[PDB]
Ligand SMILES: [K+]
């Protein structure tokens with residue numbers, strides 16, 4: 001019907017599992033950035049209001065795997081981890097480094113998987129001046145309880161729109177960890193699901209690199225990498241190579257043995273995006289976040305596809321206009337400034 005604002009399930013020897021990616025908005029970061037939330041009714045911003053709504057959403061969708069971002073450490077220990085464990089999830093956390101209050105969590109139903117390994121990633125390198133930011137990632141290797149393992153990755157990349165050099169290097173570090181964890185004895189990669197808040201928009205150079213496995217970055221200004229709103233003036237062009245040899249990551253985004261003393265990046269995965277980023281009838285963009293200064297897609301679920309996975313269904317997203325009709329995010333009903341992404345996958349056996 002005209003004007004309806006609804007999130008629908010769109011349908012596109014086996015193991016079926018669902019994955020939810022959700023940046024839940026850290027209370028400390030909300031309060032530190034109160035200018036982004038001026039549009040919100042004051043009572044809806046308190047953590048005592050937001051957490052029950054977030055937990056209710058998680059319970060409603062009952063996803064097999066949760067990839068969460070902006071999980072605040074104190075709240076995680078006091079309330080989020082106990083609540084998720086009560087719902088049947090095993091939870092693994094990786095907090096941002098430094099003075100930062102929040103991090104990434106990957107949680108999975110213990111009825112659906114066993115844990116093979118936990119592989120945190122710290123993007124902060126004290127020995128590499130480029131990598132001075134506190135962002136992190138987390139990679140789990142899971143064994144379906146019934147068959148290959150499944151590699152689940154989660155990250156929250158640097159927000160700063162100018163620093164595409166840092167963003168691409170952080171992404172390369174996550175991709176290198178995935179390449180090591182997902183490697184199988186037969187030389188192929190097990191199925192991969194890579195979720196997170198990439199702070200980069202559809203069609204940006206960083207997005208295209210993920211989807212295509214290649215990026216020619218010759219002449220690319222650092223602030224054009226992510227496609228986020230930027231001045232697009234006075235910016236340094238990416239170095240060739242982007243990051244120094246002491247990182248120990250090659251231009252194919254794999255770990256390499258460092259030794260004593262072209263402008264293309266590659267990776268070896270075949271990744272698709274769950275969402276197509278535009279509504280087919282109208283061409284209007286999908287958004288995953290909507291506050292006073294931004295309404296864009298920055299959140300993704302990427303997956304191995306023709307260890308391929310079949311996408312069975314996804315929970316449809318909304319437009320910027322749809323979100324302002326409900327007076328933006330967070331609101332009295334949606335308690336993050338992001339929307340949760342949700343997919344159902346099939347592993348054929
Ligand atoms: K390995």
Ligand SMILES: [K+]
Pocket residue numbers: 162222234235236
């Ligand atoms: K610059």
Ligand SMILES: [Mg+2]
Pocket residue numbers: 023025029070
């Ligand atoms: Mg945020």
